[PDB]
Structure formats: C-alpha cells, structure tokens
Amino acid sequence: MSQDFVTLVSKDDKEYEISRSAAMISPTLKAMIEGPFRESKGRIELKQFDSHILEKAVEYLNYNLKYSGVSEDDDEIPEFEIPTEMSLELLLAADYLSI
C-alpha cells in the first residue's frame, strides 16, 4: 500500500497531493521515491515555484491520467490551455515533473 499519493510542494509549503495512479506517469516521481528515498518519499518540494504554476503542472498529470482512463482520446477532455504567463515558470515545473 505505497502511500496511494505523492506530494508535489510549492513555495512556502503549499502541498499538492497527487494520487499514485497519476504520480507513476512521472518516471521522475517513481525514481525520486526510490532513489533519495530517505528524503523524497513521495515528496517533491519545489519550494520556490508558485502554487498556481505547480497546480497547472500537476493538473497536466491528472489530465494525462483521465486521458489514459478514457483511452479513446477524448470523452469531455478539455483543451489544455496554458497562458503565456504560466509557460515562463511552468517550463521548469514541467521539466522537474518530466513525464
């Protein structure tokens, strides 16, 4: 029963809790929990990246899970809009997330 959740954390400890089912879509989470496991035990503290950015980055992972569950491409899956303002920092969050 491996937690069922991992914690991607933003700025001053704003913790987004991501279901294992989504988490595993990031090989990076899967590595981190196993490598420096004394530390990153389903915890990724990007304690500098902002919650509204991290939210979109992890929402992509959830969206990916939904898309996968859907399987047949689109069953009311919305357009994954990313405002320009997001992209700037979201790039780094996305890189760390590294699907």
Binding site: A57, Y60, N64, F80, I82, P83, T84, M86, S87, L90, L91, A94, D95, L97, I99
Partner: peptide
C-alpha cells in the same frame, strides 16, 4: 506533451 505545449506557447509569444 506538457513541454511541447509550453514550447509552442513560448514560440508563439516570441513570434
């Protein structure tokens, strides 16, 4: 995917 979207947005912004 996310990277591609982000890159496309950045590219669009720069263009």
């Amino acid at each position: 995917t996310l990277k591609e979207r982000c890159l496309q947005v950045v590219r669009s912004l720069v263009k």
